[model samples]
Target: GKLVIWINGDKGYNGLAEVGKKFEKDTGIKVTVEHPCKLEEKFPQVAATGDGPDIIFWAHDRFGGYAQSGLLAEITPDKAFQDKLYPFTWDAVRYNGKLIAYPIAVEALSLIYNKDLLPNPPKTWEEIPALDKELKAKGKSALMFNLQEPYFTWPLIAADGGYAFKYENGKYDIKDVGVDNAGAKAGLTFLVDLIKNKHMNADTDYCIAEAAFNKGETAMTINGPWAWSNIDTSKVNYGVTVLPTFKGQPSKPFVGVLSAGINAASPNKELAKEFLENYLLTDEGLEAVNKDKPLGAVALKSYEEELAKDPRIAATMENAQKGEIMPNIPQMSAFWYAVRTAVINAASGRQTVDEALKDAQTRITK
Candidate 1:
């Protein structure tokens, strides 16, 4: 019987399926790559009924929920094996000291700037004003981001010390919330000032920001590797770099790790483990898997040489180094909506920064 793997088909699936094919060919083990719609929602439903695949490919953040529900197998990789991956990636896959997934890639926000507009990207947040003035004179935006999206705004908040939840002694403390703290307030105020001064607009969303960047209407943007597919390199000469400093501090984006995990209820756990350890974790296997796409910033330390040679990977690694790992606890579910509302309200002048953040904290804490 063949092993079945359910994976997201959006971007990285093709490359992954290719690896699966290679593994099958080399080992005579038949593997099927299935695309389950709304995988995040449907997986748990199917897994509960004992009809899930042997392996599932998804972001590491979801591993916490799956592990908590007893749907993911507890992986025990040796120290030597763990040393092969970037240290931070292990944090993403481990929940309560139990490994739940195999880290594949790292994703974080970085500054993607149009080289034609500015040969030198602004290194400091304060320098953006002068840069924006020059670009505006030339009928172009100095820099722009999705103002309404909390994902993009998180770095600004975190630059000063804002956080969804605090990590303490290997566990996240939901009680010690930092989103409404003084440091967070300072960061939010800076963003509100940008809106007030017309440097950025509160109405901007993902679509507007991406379109503007691709059309050369903006000189720089804050985005991650996911946006690379939409960018036309032929029309735009651009470079990716670590995000600029904010008020003398480096902006810290949330780092997301993409991973693959074995289903705890699977009948073929040993076979699945063999496939993952021998094929997916090796450099040769990873190269085949990433041949069709740059898997963001790879978690493998073996990719260090390759990352330096590739500008995008290099920038992504830089961002990952400077960023904070996203909290994978179930409590994070309540954090996003609350922060999004607060960011939008404050940015749009619908509420004072203090008022908006306090409300967000109350919503989460309550």
Candidate 2:
């Protein structure tokens, strides 16, 4: 019999293939590791129709919808195994009070910069204007990223106390939205002012920002472990560090966990669980998982000491400690659209920060 699993490009594929070989050798089952194009989009559609892979290597943020559709099998690690996981690892991988998936990696956004261009990364956003003044002399900017994206810009919003949903009583209260609050207005204003003054290009996107940073056109950008490949081969010398401070407040980006899960519809449900518990969650298994970028930090504490040595993982871990775990709720999809619209409206000067956030509140409430 075959156990099918879907993952992203190259990152999990090599290690998964290595793990799959061993798993097949031990269990007499073929482990098919695949990287289907447009996975984030297609998987959900196929999953709903019960035509998806038996297992998935995807983000924890997605399980909210997956679970809502009853697509995931309940995953309960034995209490002894549970004791070995980082406490917060359960925060994203769980739905309701039950364990829903096996968390493999934890991720957070951090400031990644070209050291030759930046020389010194600013400790706070307050220093950016002065630093930009210096960079401008050399025909460079201090930072550039997907300016209108809510996820990339969430730090700016949260630094001044903005939030998408009120997380309380171990659950997110979707009815208690906060994107229109005064603190959110302050954060959005600071963000818009940067573009308004030409400190960063309002036209850049994730790929373009990294492309510019790697070529030394920009000194800094906000990114995660997965994006490092854009700079890996470039001549620029880069360093990963925490994001700059916002108005004396530490930036609180959203924390994400990438996890493995079993499809509830799979005929191999029990075998899938067995494969995960017996092979994929082991020390050797995790070692392969971390072989590529080591992504964020290992959710399993046993691998923490070793993976912490990698520079990007270290900075990502540092950021994770200061981040708010992204909510695992059905309403998050709405929040993403609503908050992004808010950021776009303000960044494009189509609306004031006040008006943008107010519109966000009105839209999300619908």
Who wins the TM-score comparison? Answer: 1
lDDT of 1 by residue, 1-366 (tens): 568998776655666677788878887888887787898888898888887899998888887888889899888778888899888788888787778898988899999999988898888887887778788998998888888778898888888788787775547787888889988999999888888998888898888888899999999999998888778653788889989888788898999888889888898888888888877777776787677666767888887656668788888888888887888888787888999899989987789999999999998888
Using lDDT, give the best candidate's number: 1
- Candidate 2 per-residue C-alpha lDDT over 50-113 given as tens digits, one digit per residue, 9 for 90 to 100: 8889998888888888888888888877888887777777777877766778888888999998
lDDT of each: 0.84, 0.82
Q: What is the TM-score of each candidate against the true structure?
A: 0.94, 0.89
Q: What is the lDDT of residue 92 in candidate 2?
A: 79
Instruction: Count the clashes in each prediction.
Output: 0, 0
Q: Output the TM-score of candidate 2.
A: 0.89
